[PDB]
Amino acid sequence: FTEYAGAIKTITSALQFGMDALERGLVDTVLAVKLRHAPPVFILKTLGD
């Protein structure tokens, strides 16, 4: 029983790892979208005036 129920803990902790490595994918790619459209200050500042 404790080999069985010690095996169901491993596979969930391998699969909670599955979803929560994909929620980092959101925070990566959304920040990666911003940096493609983010020019620096010295380029954009004099275009602001």
């Binding site: 980092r24 925070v27 920040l31 990666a32 940096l35």
Partner: protein, 50 residues
């Protein structure tokens, strides 16, 4: 009248209580977040460091 059609269902969303940092700059309120905890716990390089 267009704003109710422009809201596109972002009205009627249930509001909640979010914990984050804020700051006061002039007439504008800005939120401050540093993302190294989500990058250095996984031991990848950060894109903010250029």
């Amino acid at each position: 009248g267009d704003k109710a059609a422009l809201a596109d269902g972002h009205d009627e969303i249930q509001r909640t209580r979010i914990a984050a940092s804020l700051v006061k700059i002039g007439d504008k309120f800005v939120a401050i977040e540093s993302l190294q905890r989500m990058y250095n716990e996984t031991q990848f390089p950060c894109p903010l460091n250029r």
